[PDB]
Amino acid sequence: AGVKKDIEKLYEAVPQLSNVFKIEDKIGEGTFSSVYLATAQLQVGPEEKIALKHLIPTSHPIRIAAELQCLTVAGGQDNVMGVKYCFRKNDHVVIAMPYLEHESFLDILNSLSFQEVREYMLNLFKALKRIHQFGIVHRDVKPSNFLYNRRLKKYALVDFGLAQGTHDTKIELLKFVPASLTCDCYATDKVCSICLSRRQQVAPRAGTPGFRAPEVLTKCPNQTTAIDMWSAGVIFLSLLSGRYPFYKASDDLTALAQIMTIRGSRETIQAAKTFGKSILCSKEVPAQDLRKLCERLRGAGGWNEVPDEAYDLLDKLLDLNPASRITAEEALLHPFFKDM
Amino acid sequence: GPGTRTGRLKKPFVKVEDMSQLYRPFYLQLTNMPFINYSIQKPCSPFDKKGYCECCLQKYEDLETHLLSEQHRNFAQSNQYQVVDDIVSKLVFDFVEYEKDTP
Ligand SMILES: Nc1ncnc2c1ncn2[C@@H]1O[C@H](COP(=O)(O)OP(=O)(O)O)[C@@H](O)[C@H]1O
Ligand code: BEF
Ligand SMILES: [Mg+2]
Ligand SMILES: [Mg+2]
Ligand SMILES: [Zn+2]
Ligand SMILES: [Zn+2]
Known part of the structure; x- marks a missing residue:
């Protein structure tokens, strides 16, 4: 009913779709898009399942085209989703991708094996290595944007709607996407009318707060491909601990406080200095040993044999310092992936 | 306090400020700061139009x-x-x- 009307409105908005696709169901309902499952006939192939991503028509054309261009230029290889076609009528743009049937991350956790964890992370790093080679910062790495088909052992990083370019990005369109006074409250628990009256610092939009790196949470102006590696580390932390969502926060500073309870308040404060942020935390909390944290959260019995290499890689992904944080290319060379 | 816009943050808090001192600081104040709950059963988090x-x-x-x-x-x-x-x-x-x- 509610889905049936949405499908009817989509056919009305882009009438060409009615003569190509049998739209079966709504599989994504985000703030800025809706995704539908459809069946199509290939001219010189079999029938195919297709995901149709309808972008919110308030999106600027440049942002629409930049997302499409990530898929056309970087997609189709190394576990990065590609695109078959794109249909437009006025402000209604529908991206047609091959549909990858996939598991929900809660179902992944329910039958997870250690080798499956290794393969999942390996294939995530292959996709991140490729998009980072093109100078794309995804900004929204999380399980719902990384599709996994367990039966086929097939993977696809999707959703470039929040992506930004690096300075030397190879996605052309990503390039196109009173006075403040000092006071003596700095590095204290004080406020005053001077610091309270300054304007707000602004930063590009990122994804879910529980997957944002500390430099994103603190609104650092320089946000690099390292932010995606932090997000990958959060996925790994969920896999090793069995907890999802691991960080449960709807605002940035709550997420940061949770991160400090895992990685240490003093450690986070020292790292933040290097990207120009002063953090003060009235309650000091120690850094957690990652093996003990994951083993106690996941349960005992039996997964007690996880190798040291797994938690070492997790430490490098969750490096609070974005400069020393491991890269996707380096992660693929890490001892955790011996023989793969 | 509120009247003078001057004073000290009620604890516990987290405070974030850009080192160039160009922007208003960001504050977080909660009754309790986050606590890692190991007893809550997996897969639950340990921390559990315009x-x-x-x-x-x-x-x-x-x-x-x-x-x-x-x-x-x-x-x-x-x-x-x-x-x-x-x-x-x-x-x-x-x-x-x-x-x-x-x-
Ligand atoms: N090519 C695809 N194959 C299968 N499912 C897809 C595909 N693209 C998107 N989806 C599903 O639709 C959801 C929303 O799509 P996404 O591009 O992530 O939109 P949003 O930008 O609104 O998050 C995804 O989380 C996934 O479950
Ligand atoms: F919500 Be999508 F992951 F932008
Ligand atoms: Mg998405
Ligand atoms: Mg998106
Ligand atoms: Zn408008
Ligand atoms: Zn002040």
Whole structure:
């Protein structure tokens, strides 16, 4: 009913779709898009399942085209989703991708094996290595944007709607996407009318707060491909601990406080200095040993044999310092992936 | 306190400030700071319409209303989507297209 009307409105908005696709169901309902499952006939192939991503028509054309261009230029290889076609009528743009049937991350956790964890992370790093080679910062790495088909052992990083370019990005369109006074409250628990009256610092939009790196949470102006590696580390932390969502926060500073309870308040404060942020935390909390944290959260019995290499890689992904944080290319060379 | 806009943050708190001191600090105050709960059963966390149209450069209170406004329809029908069409021109359409069904 509610889905049936949405499908009817989509056919009305882009009438060409009615003569190509049998739209079966709504599989994504985000703030800025809706995704539908459809069946199509290939001219010189079999029938195919297709995901149709309808972008919110308030999106600027440049942002629409930049997302499409990530898929056309970087997609189709190394576990990065590609695109078959794109249909437009006025402000209604529908991206047609091959549909990858996939598991929900809660179902992944329910039958997870250690080798499956290794393969999942390996294939995530292959996709991140490729998009980072093109100078794309995804900004929204999380399980719902990384599709996994367990039966086929097939993977696809999707959703470039929040992506930004690096300075030397190879996605052309990503390039196109009173006075403040000092006071003596700095590095204290004080406020005053001077610091309270300054304007707000602004930063590009990122994804879910529980997957944002500390430099994103603190609104650092320089946000690099390292932010995606932090997000990958959060996925790994969920896999090793069995907890999802691991960080449960709807605002940035709550997420940061949770991160400090895992990685240490003093450690986070020292790292933040290097990207120009002063953090003060009235309650000091120690850094957690990652093996003990994951083993106690996941349960005992039996997964007690996880190798040291797994938690070492997790430490490098969750490096609070974005400069020393491991890269996707380096992660693929890490001892955790011996023989793969 | 509030009257003078001067004083000290009630604890516990987290405070974040840009080191150039150009921006208002960000604050977090909670009754309790986060606590890692190992006893809650997995997979639970251990810590357990209005919008802006980039086309019209305009805030809106209801999406469906805004999409039908004269200024948005004017943008929607313009040449501003050529940047999208130029990418589509490189893609190959390989689906079967049916004639419209008629009685
Ligand atoms: N090519 C695809 N194959 C299968 N499912 C998809 C595909 N693209 C998107 N989806 C599903 O639709 C959801 C929303 O799509 P996404 O591009 O992530 O939109 P949003 O930008 O709104 O998050 C995804 O989380 C996934 O479940
Ligand atoms: F919500 Be999508 F992951 F932008
Ligand atoms: Mg998404
Ligand atoms: Mg998205
Ligand atoms: Zn002050
Ligand atoms: Zn508009």
